[PDB]
């Protein structure tokens, strides 16, 4: 509601005293989802006391439902960081499975030609390598 | 005395708000607590999930891209051998693939040993 | 007749009071079950995205498989024929095999230091 | 030892449909990957078409595309092309091979 509000939360309704109607309006919580509302009676006390139980079993209800999505959650986290290091490894291994083979081929593609010159330029490349890790 | 008898209209009415207030009296706000609870525990566990789960969220990307890099240097290879002899020379490609080789050597180690070094800092 | 009317008059000088602390604490209990609702749904809401999130991971994750078999199908008829198979050819061969060396060491290097972060953050 | 010997070329009008074969010998078949060479005595090798050892992971050259089809039977050792709407262009020795060796060949010549 927009103006309605206003419209209606003025004067007091069921024979509240004007001032202590008027003081629930500036002590209210969240004006923004919320009017203030008479409650006359021990009756309407119970009322709203039975409505807090009946709502927190509601409440606890989805918890619980939420609380099994958790544990599938986690589960499922797990298994997830599982398949990470499998596939890790198997990358790591078919990695060095295709420098293998590009080697094979290029050893053999090249049978009885000159060591050439881009080769040995490797060979600087790689033996400066292996000696900056020993 | 006649009608008077307004008096038990004003007796059980009495009672009545009486034995409401006992019943007021006996409600207590104990589960309405535990949902107060369990709303902040569970945010936590929750919490600490979704952490993980961007962490190696990452980690598949990562995954994902090199799987991915890996499969074109496979395709390479299947390119050398369907390339017939007189065609070999025009076949760049394997050379590239170790030129590009050993940048990546030389950019592995100097990672490694960064991480070498944040792992001994993260130590002291 | 009349003196009764001093009783419950007094017990009105007793239930009044008990009125106004009940009513102040069921604005207050109530208060609590509003934030409660609120909070709830807010934690449900977060629970079915993260649900979307885990599902997009599975998925990336199945796709990671499938090319990874792919690679592999694709990889081992190549070994085998490559299998059926000089100065220079020796030496050709002494190079790129140190590649294939430094490869291996930088795999075992990587791997290493991902097991002792597998020990670190526990 | 990559031994192969291709054969069903010969003589035929533009818009002429073919089909080559290649025998494999010397090695395990199975396992390689094979292409179509062609060689027209002025020019240079052109592949017009390749495959994978088992059939899939099949390419052409735009040249041949819509109109020529390549495959292979492991169990005979055998590689095939179909090549249909012929061309005086296509004219050429047909070679098969990979990078361990090609055939002889086979004439495919289209009259103009």
């Known amino acids: 509601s927009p103006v309605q509000i206003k419209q209606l939360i003025q004067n007091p309704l069921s024979g509240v005293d004007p001032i202590i109607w008027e003081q629930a309006k500036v002590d209210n919580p969240d004006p923004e989802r919320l009017i203030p509302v008479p409650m006359i009676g021990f009756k309407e006390l119970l009322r709203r006391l039975e409505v807090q139980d009946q709502m927190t079993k509601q409440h606890q209800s989805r918890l619980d439902i939420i609380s099994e999505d958790i544990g599938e959650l986690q589960k499922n986290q797990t298994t997830t960081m599982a398949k990470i290091g499998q596939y890790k490894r198997k990358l790591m291994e078919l990695s060095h499975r295709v420098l293998q083979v590009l080697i094979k081929q290029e050893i053999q593609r090249k049978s009885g030609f000159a060591i050439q010159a881009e080769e040995e330029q490797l060979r600087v490349q790689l033996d400066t390598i292996q000696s900056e890790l020993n | 005395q006649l009608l008077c008898q307004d008096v038990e209209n004003f007796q059980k009415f009495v009672k009545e708000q009486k034995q409401v207030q006992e019943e007021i009296s006996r409600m207590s706000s104990k589960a309405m607590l535990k949902v107060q609870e369990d709303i902040k525990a569970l945010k936590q566990l929750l919490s600490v999930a979704s952490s993980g789960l961007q962490r190696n969220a990452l980690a598949i990307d990562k995954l994902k891209i090199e799987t991915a890099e890996e499969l074109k240097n496979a395709e390479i290879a299947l390119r050398t051998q369907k390339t017939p002899p007189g065609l070999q020379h025009e076949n760049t490609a394997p050379a590239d693939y170790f030129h590009t080789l050993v940048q990546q050597f030389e950019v592995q180690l100097q990672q490694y040993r960064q991480q070498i070094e944040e792992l001994e800092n993260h130590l002291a | 007749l009349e003196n009764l009317i001093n009783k419950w008059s007094l017990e009105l000088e007793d239930q009044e009071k008990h009125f106004l602390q009940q009513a102040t604490q069921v604005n207050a209990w109530d208060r609590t079950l509003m934030q409660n609702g609120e909070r709830i749904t807010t934690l449900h809401r977060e629970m079915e995205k993260v649900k979307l999130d885990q599902k997009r991971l599975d998925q990336e994750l199945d796709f990671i498989l499938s090319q990874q078999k792919e690679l592999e199908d694709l990889l081992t008829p190549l070994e085998e024929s490559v299998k059926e198979q000089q100065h220079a050819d020796e030496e050709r061969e002494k190079t790129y095999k140190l590649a294939e060396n430094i490869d291996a060491q930088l795999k075992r290097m990587a791997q290493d230091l991902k097991e002792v972060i597998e020990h670190l953050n526990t | 030892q990559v031994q192969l010997q291709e054969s069903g070329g010969g003589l035929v009008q533009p818009g002429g449909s073919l089909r080559l074969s290649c025998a494999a010998s010397?090695?395990?078949?199975?396992?390689?990957?094979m292409s179509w060479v062609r060689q027209a005595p002025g020019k240079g090798l052109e592949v017009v078409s390749d495959?994978?050892?088992?059939?899939?992971?099949?390419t052409y050259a735009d040249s041949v595309k819509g109109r020529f089809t390549i495959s292979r039977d492991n169990a005979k050792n055998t590689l095939y092309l179909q090549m249909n709407s012929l061309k005086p262009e296509d004219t050429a020795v047909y070679y098969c091979?990979?990078?361990?060796?090609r055939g002889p060949g086979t004439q495919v010549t289209v009259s103009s």
């Open positions: 091979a990979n990078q361990y060796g």
């Open positions: 010397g090695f395990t078949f199975s396992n390689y990957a």
């Open positions: 495959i994978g050892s088992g059939g899939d992971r099949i």
